[PDB]
Design a protein around this ligand. Structure first.
Ligand SMILES: Nc1ccc([N+](=O)[O-])cc1C(=O)O
Ligand SMILES: Nc1ccc([N+](=O)[O-])cc1C(=O)O
Lengths: 420, 420
């Protein structure tokens, strides 16, 4: 069998690239994934995978389709996300929000370009094609192959005045699709891991640290000189608190590094946002300033601890602040992952030509949709071509992309013909 | 301390009753919890718990407020749900959809009447008041008391053409509130358990069993006689398939009963809805009919197994059908429950007057929002007065409700002054 499907895949090298660019071209930042979902649904429908739209919202939804199998075999889920990182105008976070790389996809040489291709339509293109090859090559599987394309993968979260349809992400994402029928025995989340598989990822907790000072004064009355930490202007104390927290962050990752069978989890910290006062009434400095922190957790850390740590860092400075968490997610290590691990490995060795190696710590210390599957007892690991977008890589090598498709296919033929 | 708060609660017995009826009277079936959330938000705000609205939709949201503590202590979460079971016009499921009991609440004697009070504003009223007592009695707590009132508790799930805002429930419910900041060291879910605490609850999986027959014929051409199982009318084969599944259902609970520390899980089965063809074009019998089954799971059952079981029940009749699951949730047993269990137990003995006993199997075999807390590592158990609405009880005794408020208060006083 395996030789039939392999030759078949070489048949669709063009189809592989096209699907990637066509998908890559669609503007699909988190919050506008609908357009891409429609493309995949049609693509899936067109190929007889009989898709369904699972979603909280009618313009933000997941697509679940499946390649039915003869019967009595393990079922494997293939997963990737619809949304992309950069919106068309994200001038807040990028110095150059207009680079072509951020919002398009193209074939400039035996490689494919576009942040929207690396994350994450390139991998999705791969298993979409791999499923096509099996069906068209009429391969024999006893188990179903489930094709899950999800939305809201990326870590956008509502906070404060940003609530609802536009800001939601992972709550309406893969975990929704699963809890509403996209279940299988094992699941392979396809993302760029550089052909290295990982069965651990990290949780996270988001803290909104607000520091209090005051009292506000009309600028002609502001009192100086005063020590930074005793400033009445909360932006100034925040300045100090930011630098203390930056050192805490430096140590946090070292202390909480944990090595797992699945990978080595090095959980980092970052201050994603800050805001105090409003730009259109600055005549009075603000009595409070806020920062938004992204703290990663290894699978074994309780977020309440981390809050208390950050609470402590604040107390050491004699500041008065409110540390409040507005997001908490858990990271998991796969249990019972072996069958999929093994199936993947044989395929990998056959195609790539060498054993799989330990993934880099960053690839095991982030959020990937393996956590929802593992959360619900569907053993999951992540594996794909290219290097991580957060790295960040900007292209894929079509040969690599073609290899990944073979591995996905072979993994399926292997695993799906084993009885659970 | 404990006596100060106890005398205080007798101070607010009427407020206890008023709060329940006022809350019970609000029409708040799942899908319209908005009016009630607003009520609680203002109630919470009026009393200084500084509430916040956590929700996916602006008319369906959870309310989280908290009674701040001095510092360096464990924090305890109190939880109850806003929604009620029966909508004002639910003529589809109830023979008398107009009974006063289904949609209102009233104080007719030392007891309070109303399905909306038993499930679930009676308990919510209890701890809302308990929080009031502590604050008003200036009791000493080192840790926060978190007041979480949620929506989408009840098992309404979107399916088929019923998707979106109106049909969503627990996905936007408590698990949303927690994943977005309503975290504590421990959590107590207040519902009617008959003053027996349980820290295990059951999962569930929903299957849409669709059976195919045919071919369609205009009534004057329908062929008879034919055996039931060979009928062209898909409603007829379904009649046979329903009785097979009913016998499978009788056995399922016996085979899968499991005993846990938190309780004994007896997982039942039920066929909640059926529909084949449409009432406004009956001249042609339908080539397919569907039933929607609600299958509970003990925490250790894999939803994939139960599907194969039912797929089997179909295959044994030689029927061709499509068994597809459209909901899957997991049931959990609490881990690390001891501190709450004990804190609860001491209060119970003092107020109720005797040791606590094992809960009834139904109360451990359902869905309660303890599963979301436990899923995310917050040990949780459920305890409240009265007997379960699913039973279904139709009233609460004002005395028992007052006791339950005393227990909640005492639990908080104990637990919140322990350091984690
Ligand atoms: N899961 C991810 C989420 C976000 C980003 N990013 O760089 O914005 C990358 C990945 C990834 O898979 O590499
Ligand atoms: N959590 C529940 C959900 C539904 C129902 N019901 O009878 O429809 C009852 C309860 C309960 O708590 O007893």
């Amino acid at each position: 069998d395996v030789a039939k499907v392999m030759k078949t895949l070489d048949g669709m090298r063009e189809g592989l690239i096209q699907t990637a660019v066509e998908l890559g071209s669609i503007e699909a930042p988190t919050g506008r994934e609908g357009a891409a979902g429609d493309y995949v649904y049609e693509w899936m429908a067109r190929n007889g995978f009989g898709p369904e739209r699972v979603g909280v919202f009618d313009d933000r939804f997941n697509v679940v389709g499946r390649l039915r199998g003869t019967g009595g075999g393990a079922s494997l889920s293939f997963n990737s996300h619809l949304d992309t990182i950069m919106a068309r105008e994200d001038t807040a976070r990028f110095a150059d929000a207009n680079d072509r790389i951020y919002h398009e996809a193209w074939h400039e040489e035996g490689r494919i370009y576009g942040y929207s291709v690396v994350n994450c339509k390139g991998p999705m293109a791969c298993w979409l094609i791999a499923a096509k090859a099996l069906k068209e090559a009429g391969a024999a599987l006893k188990g179903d192959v489930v094709l899950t394309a999800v939305c809201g993968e990326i870590d956008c979260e509502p906070v404060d005045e940003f609530q609802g349809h536009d800001y939601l992400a992972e709550d309406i994402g893969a975990r929704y699709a699963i809890s509403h029928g996209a279940i299988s025995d094992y699941a392979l989340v396809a993302e760029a891991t550089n052909f290295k598989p990982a069965w651990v990822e990290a949780g996270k907790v988001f803290l909104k640290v607000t520091v209090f000072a005051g009292p506000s004064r009309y600028t002609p009355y502001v009192p100086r000189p005063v020590a930074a930490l005793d400033s009445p202007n909360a932006i100034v104390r925040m300045a100090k608190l930011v630098e203390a927290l930056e050192e805490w962050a430096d140590n946090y990752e070292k202390r909480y590094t944990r090595e797992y069978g699945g990978g080595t989890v090095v959980p980092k910290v970052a201050i994603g946002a800050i805001r105090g006062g409003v730009p259109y009434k600055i005549y009075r400095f603000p009595e409070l300033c806020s920062i938004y922190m992204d703290i990663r957790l290894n699978p074994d850390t309780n977020p309440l601890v981390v809050q208390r740590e950050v609470e402590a860092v604040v107390s050491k400075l004699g500041l008065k602040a409110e540390v409040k968490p507005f997001l908490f997610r858990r990271g998991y290590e796969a249990q019972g992952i072996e069958p999929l691990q093994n199936a993947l490995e044989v395929a990998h060795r056959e195609v790539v030509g060498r054993p799989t190696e330990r993934p880099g710590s960053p690839e095991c210390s982030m959020w990937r949709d393996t956590n929802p599957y593992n959360e619900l007892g569907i053993p999951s690991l992540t594996y794909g071509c290219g290097g991580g977008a957060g790295g960040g890589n900007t292209y894929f090598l079509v040969d690599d992309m073609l290899k990944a498709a073979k591995v996905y296919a072979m993994t399926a033929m292997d695993l799906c013909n084993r009885t659970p």
